[PDB]
Each structure stands twice: as structure tokens, then as C-alpha cells.
């Protein structure tokens, strides 16, 4: 028992991190097989960042201008191209620690671990959600760019995020590994703000199931509700609509605890209308929405990797 | 900017995890050089656990009775001894992935990462505090025993915790790596409960500094206080006394933000007496006490390892 914000083991991803330098800009890169992936703004100076023309800056560079280091070792670059907001540097050495991997684009509400890095070295790991407004609530400093987010399935690392920038209110924005941004952000120092965020309703419900599994059951009431009535209430508290797919995805947890999803929905509705009245759930005073149904199952059933 | 519960990168520790089986009991072990460390209760049956005589169970075993596996590979045991509540199995193969390491015993209030494992494989990693009452607030299931907690300093892994048991209220208890328990717990299924816990005052103060660093400054008042007056108030809200050593340890953060420790103490005193009045600090509705001063600095200044 116990329930924590748990990150995936970071080892397989630690073995892929390198430092990429172009002039006086240094940031992190991800070395898979014989390719290094990093943010394209590695090619920018201080003066380039209001409105850079990346294609123009890139044509002016050749292979040798890119200093890639893996620990003590410099990797010789032998090719370079740009894909969306990412740069791919072909190198002459395949990374022997490359794990089985894929590139995926996640959906809003999905969680992943971030391996925060500086100078190609790891600072730490933490779990995050892709927010409905396409930001993440990260912890990133200058030099964190090229840090990645990922999920693990048995032996396979799915890379879903590469870090690029910080937006107003200290939230974060970045790309998939093909260099396409999550949300309408661009990689230039210009005025940009995330839209209003919302609560990821299905995740709140998954965490309420986790609470029942851990014996924290005071908020369960004796009612049910329809999906329609529930969704009218949720909408007023800035909660995402719950879809039938969300209901289906909650099925394992429902089946395990014996509590129908629509009954849990009646219990959440009461929480939203009445507040928690100074009580906690799993040690928390606020409803948490950064655990997915799958995150709850893996934690509570002891799913392992590697 | 941003502030998260960040765990150390787990790779160096992932490379040391193995599975130890003795009869039908399987749990996790830590393979450093040519020695495997695991909880001694690996030698127990179901019927042994109310009141086991470990020394008696152990004399009945020989080397070959211990099945140690590292992935696909079985490690041949060539010696065994017991140290306090830990078993040391000498094996014929040195772990080539052994990092530089030490065994340390931490003090109450200190944080560390836990690499939760089942069958010698990692489930996830999370940050924890050794509580004043010598429990940790973990997330552990059956089979998690032998999971370890650690800190990293540059390249050196300091192992401070090995997991043994779960106590009432779903908190956790375990040993240092010489097999001595934190707190007055014993490794037998008998009635045991942790004493009343308290809040780790110095950590709450470190997290308040983190909030100011991140621009969350609404709770700062215009007063100071003496250490004595502060400690009388803290005592009533079940906060640990703040010592002069705690004040000294907070010095970097104080110096960075420009806020004297005793002024931050005046601000915390107001929080304890008046509550937070429905506001959050760094997204939290409760005061957090599982970040140390060092955890705050490393996160906010981007300290890396490996
Ligand atoms: C990233 O680590 C790095 N970016 C550069 C760089 F452009 C040149 C040299 C070295 C580095 S490292 C960095 C991560 C940020 C810094 C603070 N927290 C982070 O997450 N990214 C940026 O600095 C980034 C790059 C230029 C401006 N950037 C921003 O993050 C800015 N944000 C925006 O302008 C906004 F998002 F639009 F709001 C900033 C600096 C926070 C104001 C570019 C987007 C290319
Ligand atoms: C641990 O993973 C394992 N212990 C055994 C074992 F003894 C025999 C075979 C296999 C395993 S695996 C396990 C971790 C626990 C289980 C639930 N959450 C955890 O953190 N430890 C125990 O089961 C442990 C061992 C016997 C009884 N144990 C307890 O944790 C019990 N607690 C207590 O009796 C109390 F702490 F005193 F309260 C239990 C099972 C939670 C009631 C012993 C202490 C040797």
C-alpha cells in the first residue's frame, strides 16, 4: 500500500543523453543508433532568438561545426538535417546502449517521465502530464533544452517529448521527436501564452480508485448519476467532459474495486459541489489529475520493466 | 522555473538489482562487486513469520539453496553470512556495473530516492523522507522487499535504505545496508506501530525558499522573530524544533533570496496560526516537508550526476 508520484526507471534513457554545442550554445541531445536528435535552436545566438530563420542559420553550418560529446568522447558528425523543430545529426558511431524504442505523439491527459538534463548529464526524473492546453508543469532551467520525456512498455522506450521552452506562469512547451510542437507554440522568443487549462477528469477518477484501493474511502456516497448529468456539473468546475472511451478505460479499476464508474462520478460530483471540507485524500488536499488509469494499475499491481 | 518532487536518476542502481529465491520466497537483492545483499527473511516460510529464529533457519541452509538471478543468468553462491537483518551472499561473479558506492545511515528529515522493484526488476522511482518517527511514506507491495533507497553525489551512490515491511496506516520500515532498522521495529509479523510523526520544520522552510525563488511570494510578512519564540509556536503545531544547525544549513537559500531565516520563520509562524486561507504555495494546499535545503538547491541550480 501507499501511493506516490512514481517515475519510470530512467537508466535506458540515461544511456542515450549527450551534449550538443554549436558556437556558444550548448544543450542536450538524444543519441539513438547513429543519430543525435536535439532542438534546432542549438544553432542560434543570443541575437537570433526574437525571430530566427533556422533554415538560413543551418545552411551556413557544416558537419564539423557541431560538437557532440558523450562523456569524455567526442562523436564525429557526418551529416545533419532539420525535421520541423528538431535537428538530426548523423554520427559515425552507433550508441551501443540504444534501447528498443519508438517515437510517439501523446494525447492531452497522458502522463510520462521527464529526465531533466544539463550539459548532457542527468539532474533528476519526475512524472508529468500533457495538459489539455498542451503545456506541461515541469521543472526546467536554462540548459534543460533537449531533455526528453518517455514511457516504458516492458523493454521498449516510447519517447514522446523533447523540451524547448518555458511560457508565462512557469509552465513548459516542447515537441514530439519528429519536431512538431504540442499546441500552437513556436520556437522563438516572442509573446505566447497557453490557453486556460482544465482538469483531466478521467485521471481524477483513476486517482479516486487508487484512494479506495489504499483504504481511503470517506468520500464515497450512496448515489449514482448519468454521464450527461455528471458532464454538465463537471463543465462548470472546468473539468474535461468524460467520454464513453474514458468510461471503458476505467473498467479494470471499476471491476477491481466493485464500484461502477458512474457511482464514482456521483462521488466526484459531490466533491466538486461541496469541497473536501478540510479532509485529504491519499494525503492530498486537492484532487489530483496527473495519474492515468494505467498509472494507477501499474503502481497498485507492481508492473515492472527492463 | 517550476518545482517538482524529483528523484535521482536510477540507472546506476538499476544495474545492481537481482532476484533472490530461497524455497518459495523470492525478493530483491543488491549486487555490488561479488556480494549480494538482501533481507534475511528471504529464508522464511509462511509459517515462520510470527516469530522466526533467523539464526536457526540459516544454519539449516547451504550456499546452493540460494537462487540468485541477474536477468537470464544465475549467479553461483559461494558463501553466505548474516549481518543484523541483512543477508550477504558471496557470489563467484563481480557485478561489472557496480558504481562507486558507500553505505550510509541517514538522519530523520533526510530525503532519498527509492527504486521500487519486483522479482529483481524495477517498477519505478520516487523521492521519500526518513520521517521523525523512523518510517517512510512509501509505495510498496508484496515482493518489494530488498528494494533500496539512495542518494547520488557526482558519481557516488550512497545506499541508505533497504525495504523490509509495512506498518499500520500504510507507512514503511526498513534497514540501513548493515541491516540495522531505522527506529525500534523488528522483522517479524507482530503488532508494531510507529510513534506519532512530526513535521520536519527545516524542510518546510527550504520549500518556502523554493516558492520565493519561483516567484510565489504572497505569504511573506513584514516581521521577524527570535528562534525561541518561533520554536514555542512550532511545538504546538507538532513541528520539530529548529536548531542553530538548521539555521546554518538554510544559509545558502537565505543568502540567495535575501531573506533572513528568522524572517522566513516569522512568515511560517503566521501560516501555522492563520492557515493558508484557501491559497496554494507552488501548487500545493499543504506545507510540504519532504524537500531538504540541499534538494532545493540542486533542483533550482541544476546540479547533475553520472
Ligand atoms: C533551453 O534550455 C535553452 N535554450 C537555449 C538557447 F536558445 C540558446 C542557448 C542555450 C539555450 S538552452 C531553454 C529552456 C528554458 C529556459 C528557462 N526554462 C526553460 O525551460 N529554452 C529557451 O531559453 C527558449 C529558447 C529561446 C527563448 N526560450 C524560452 O524558453 C523563452 N520563452 C519564450 O520566449 C516563450 F515561451 F515564448 F514564452 C524564455 C527564455 C523563458 C523567455 C527559444 C524559444 C528558442
Ligand atoms: C516483502 O516484500 C516481502 N516479505 C516476504 C516474506 F516474508 C516472505 C516471502 C516473500 C516476501 S516479500 C514485504 C513488503 C510488504 C508487503 C506489503 N507491503 C510491504 O511493504 N514484507 C513483508 O511482508 C513483511 C515480512 C513479514 C511480515 N511483513 C510485513 O510487512 C507485515 N507487517 C508487519 O507485520 C508489521 F510491520 F509489523 F506491521 C505485513 C505483511 C504488512 C502485515 C516480515 C516483517 C518478515
From Swiss-Prot, chains A, B:
Annotated phenotype, changing residue 145 to A: Complete loss of 3C-like proteinase nsp5 cleavage
Known catalytic reactions: TSAVLQ-|-SGFRK-NH2 and SGVTFQ-|-GKFKK the two peptides corresponding to the two self-cleavage sites of the SARS 3C-like proteinase are the two most reactive peptide substrates. The enzyme exhibits a strong preference for substrates containing Gln at P1 position and Leu at P2 position
Cytoplasmic compartment residues: 1-306
Record entry for activity regulation: Inhibited by pyridone-containing alpha-ketoamides compounds 13a and 13b. In turn, alpha-ketoamide 13b (tert-butyl (1-((S)-1-(((S)-4-(benzylamino)-3,4-dioxo-1-((S)-2-oxopyrrolidin-3-yl)butan-2-yl)amino)-3-cyclopropyl-1-oxopropan-2-yl)-2-oxo-1,2-dihydropyridin-3-yl)carbamate) inhibits SARS-CoV-2 replication in human lung cells. Inhibited ex vivo by michael acceptor inhibitor N3. Inhibited ex vivo by compound 11a and 11b.
Domain of life: Viruses
Job description of the protein: Cleaves the C-terminus of replicase polyprotein at 11 sites. Recognizes substrates containing the core sequence [ILMVF]-Q-|-[SGACN]. Cleaves and inactivates human TRMT1, preventing tRNA guanine(26)-dimethylation of tRNAs. May cleave human NLRP1 in lung epithelial cells, thereby activating the NLRP1 inflammasome pathway. May cleave human GSDMD, triggering alternative GSDME-mediated epithelial cell death upon activation of the NLRP1 inflammasome, which may enhance the release interleukins 1B, 6, 16 and 18. Also able to bind an ADP-ribose-1''-phosphate (ADRP).
Subunit relationships: 3CL-PRO exists as monomer and homodimer. Only the homodimer shows catalytic activity. Interacts with host FBXO22; this interaction promotes the proteasomal degradation of nsp5.
Name of the protein: 3C-like proteinase nsp5
Organism: Severe acute respiratory syndrome coronavirus 2 (2019-nCoV)
Organism lineage string: Viruses, Riboviria, Orthornavirae, Pisuviricota, Pisoniviricetes
Gene: rep
Shown part of the complete sequence: 3264 to 3569 of 7096
Amino acid at each position: 500500500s501507499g501511493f506516490r508520484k512514481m517515475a519510470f526507471p530512467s537508466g535506458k534513457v540515461e544511456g542515450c543523453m549527450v551534449q550538443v554545442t554549436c558556437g556558444t550554445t550548448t544543450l542536450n541531445g538524444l543519441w539513438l543508433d547513429d543519430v543525435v536528435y536535439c532542438p534546432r535552436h542549438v544553432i542560434c545566438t543570443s541575437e537570433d532568438m526574437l525571430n530566427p530563420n533556422y533554415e538560413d542559420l543551418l545552411i551556413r553550418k557544416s558537419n564539423h561545426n557541431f560538437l557532440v560529446q558523450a562523456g569524455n568522447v567526442q562523436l564525429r558528425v557526418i551529416g545533419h538535417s532539420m525535421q520541423n523543430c528538431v535537428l538530426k545529426l548523423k554520427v559515425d558511431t552507433a550508441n551501443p546502449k540504444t534501447p528498443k524504442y519508438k517515437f510517439v505523439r501523446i494525447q492531452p491527459g497522458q502522463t510520462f517521465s521527464v529526465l531533466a538534463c544539463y550539459n548532457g548529464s542527468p539532474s533528476g526524473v519526475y512524472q508529468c502530464a500533457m495538459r489539455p492546453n498542451f503545456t506541461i508543469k515541469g521543472s526546467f532551467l536554462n540548459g534543460s533544452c533537449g531533455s526528453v520525456g518517455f514511457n516504458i512498455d516492458y523493454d521498449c522506450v516510447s519517447f514522446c517529448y523533447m523540451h524547448h521552452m518555458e511560457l508565462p506562469t512557469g509552465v513548459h512547451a516542447g515537441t514530439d521527436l519528429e519536431g512538431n510542437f504540442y499546441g500552437p507554440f513556436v520556437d522563438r522568443q516572442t509573446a505566447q501564452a497557453a490557453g486556460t487549462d482544465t482538469t483531466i477528469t478521467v485521471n481524477v477518477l483513476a486517482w479516486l480508485y487508487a484512494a479506495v484501493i489504499n483504504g481511503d474511502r470517506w468520500f464515497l456516497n450512496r448515489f449514482t448519476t448519468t454521464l450527461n448529468d455528471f458532464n454538465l456539473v463537471a463543465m462548470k468546475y472546468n473539468y474535461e467532459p468524460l467520454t464513453q472511451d474514458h468510461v471503458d478505460i476505467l473498467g479494470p479499476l471499476s471491476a477491481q474495486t466493485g464500484i461502477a464508474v458512474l457511482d464514482m462520478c456521483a462521488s466526484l460530483k459531490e466533491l466538486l459541489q461541496n469541497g473536501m471540507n478540510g479532509r485529504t485524500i491519499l494525503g492530498s488536499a486537492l484532487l489530483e489529475d496527473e495519474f492515468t488509469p494505467f498509472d494507477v494499475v501499474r503502481q497498485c499491481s507492481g508492473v515492472t520493466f527492463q
